[PDB]
Design a protein around this ligand. Structure first.
Ligand code: HEM
Ligand code: HEM
Ligand code: HEM
Ligand code: HEM
Lengths: 146, 142, 142, 146
């Protein structure tokens, strides 16, 4: 993706304060609560019946961490999101059968989570830079679908 | 969005013409969707999606029958499609975006098969009708 | 999708907490929208969209007041928002896709200002509420 | 866009049978009828009161010819849509203020018009090729928005 110098620095600076473990679990949990149909990919994770159940589920927290850690890796390769995610793109298509629309929903929930966690520091321009990134990542992950 | 009385007239006329081909049209619309919008294939990994497969033809028929049911009960779609709205919301869990893609492919299919009846006003009414069906099918999602 | 009584309670509670800041938050949501989704700027060629613009501030207050009215009349949204549905359908004619962009930006704004109150359950109820508002505002488009 | 040789030849072959002025007027008229909010840019065109008034409006037909003539010319540059539509992209953003969602709506209406015009010759594979082209043109026109 194409970020201006100001946008790249916005993204980098904020990400240095993110505890991936914690934000990942929050982001995945909120995806499952806010858009419950997404629970279709996690039948084996246990109790997902209520917000509290979802949010405290250790398997949700574990997966959340996995996902955001891979996400973090892309932050290191903003110039080549496609090449970076090619293997996972094929995995999500061919083995997991995940509709790429889910990548877009997670991107939006992640933005909500950063705003919730960071408050006033997540200003309009910072949000804008993160929206570009999240769209970039979702496009990178949907790229090998066929 | 709500179907006007003229819309209901338009839909019933066009659908009436579909008649006995509803199931074959349902099948073609699905094949058009799978080829045009490959991400929709993620919901059918358990099907043989080869052209003319019995799975696709049977599914195509079930889709068309549900559409016929909705036309017959256009005045009360929510009740008519209740069971289907529960199935999609609780079991299938198809992202709502995909409803727009199938609707587009059904419109294309009807266009290719109803030269005489696919006027601008009918096209408008059918588009609204498919949007309403989609709305009812996703209404219990959350 | 309908709002459940728990949704209604969550919404009234969260909006209750917005209180007097509703106008300020409406302005910030627009700002977020203009920077994050630049295509939305096409509907405001006549405004100064610079940070701090009084035009954005004024419009932010109007939007927020409409949402306050919607919360107050949550069981009767269509009638309460009737003049605004007419306005959007027949004069402004904003493409329906845009309502989802503003809704997201309102959610982000609320998250950034209501740490304590923006729980996962409240987040879900607010998203449903904004989608309902969006649906009413575009109900007369065609 | 990336089309296989087979796809390009399917696109070009059908296009050779199109009456550009006719299809242009039909597609624009149907856009205005099916998604009436798109009429917002055309109040100077006169009577758009009914389907018949829209479809018969000479200003609508003339605009349709202009739009589809440009589209038609783009078909010769499938490999470089972005470059081909750059100036038009800037114009639509900076001077005309057209939300790029309108390009996507027009693309879907165009596909429906081709289907109506060609019937059975508009096969699933041919549609698929045109879906790629219409999404490509829409993206190329939205490219310079800011
Ligand atoms: C930022 C976007 C995402 C990234 C970077 C990502 C990354 C990953 C990674 C690294 C794995 C582990 C692969 C392995 O087994 O070696 C995985 C698995 C998985 N992901 Fe994604 N993911 C993303 C979004 C999503 C979304 C939105 C969903 C569905 C809502 C999803 C569903 C899954 C599932 C079902 C698995 C398999 C978990 C298991 O094995 O039970 N992912 N993902
Ligand atoms: C006009 C919109 C739609 C209608 C009327 C419709 C109707 C139906 C019907 C009647 C069934 C069969 C239920 C049964 O066997 O008892 C069904 C199942 C199914 N639908 Fe929907 N559907 C629509 C949209 C979609 C979309 C957009 C998708 C995904 C892209 C989808 C995915 C499925 C799947 C995966 C099944 C189960 C197939 C199987 O395993 O047999 N549906 N639908
Ligand atoms: C929650 C969704 C929305 C609400 C509650 C809302 C509410 C309103 C209100 C109260 C007004 C002022 C009407 C008057 O002057 O009496 C207005 C006007 C307007 N709205 Fe909407 N609106 C919403 C979404 C949108 C979106 C998504 C857009 C475009 C991106 C939009 C574009 C406009 C424009 C261009 C005007 C006229 C502004 C002016 O010239 O002063 N609205 N809206
Ligand atoms: C395939 C998509 C399209 C193409 C290739 C296209 C192309 C063009 C061209 C070549 C012109 C004339 C530019 C000039 O004066 O130099 C134009 C003008 C214009 N277009 Fe687009 N256009 C497309 C879609 C749309 C859509 C969907 C709308 C709105 C619904 C739109 C609204 C306009 C308007 C309002 C003008 C100015 C007309 C005038 O001043 O008479 N265009 N377009």
């Amino acid at each position: 993706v194409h970020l201006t110098p100001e946008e790249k620095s916005a993204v980098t600076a904020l990400w240095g304060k993110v505890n991936v473990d914690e934000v990942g679990g929050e982001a995945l949990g909120r995806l499952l609560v806010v858009y419950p149909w997404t629970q279709r990919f996690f039948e084996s994770f246990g109790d997902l019946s209520t917000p509290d159940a979802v949010m405290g589920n250790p398997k949700v927290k574990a997966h959340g961490k996995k996902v955001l850690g891979a996400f973090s890796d892309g932050l290191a390769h903003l110039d080549n999101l496609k090449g970076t995610f090619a293997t996972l793109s094929e995995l999500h298509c061919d083995k997991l059968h995940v509709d790429p629309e889910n990548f877009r929903l997670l991107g939006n929930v992640l933005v909500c989570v950063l705003a919730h966690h960071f408050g006033k520091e997540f200003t309009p321009p910072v949000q804008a830079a993160y929206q570009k990134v999240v769209a970039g990542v979702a496009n990178a992950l949907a790229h090998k679908y066929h | 969005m709500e179907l006007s009385p003229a819309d209901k007239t338009n839909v019933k006329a066009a659908w009436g013409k579909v008649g006995a081909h509803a199931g074959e049209y349902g099948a073609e619309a699905l094949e058009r969707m799978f080829l045009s919008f490959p991400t929709t294939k993620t919901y059918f990994p358990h099907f043989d999606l080869s052209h003319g497969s019995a799975q696709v033809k049977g599914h195509g028929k079930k889709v068309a029958d549900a559409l016929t049911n909705a036309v017959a009960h256009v005045d009360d779609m929510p009740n008519a499609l209740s069971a289907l709205s529960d199935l999609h919301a609780h079991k299938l869990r198809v992202d709502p975006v995909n409803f727009k893609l199938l609707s587009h492919c059904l419109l294309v299919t009807l266009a290719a098969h109803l030269p005489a009846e696919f006027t601008p006003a009918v096209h408008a009414s059918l588009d609204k009708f498919l949007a309403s069906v989609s709305t009812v099918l996703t209404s219990k999602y959350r």
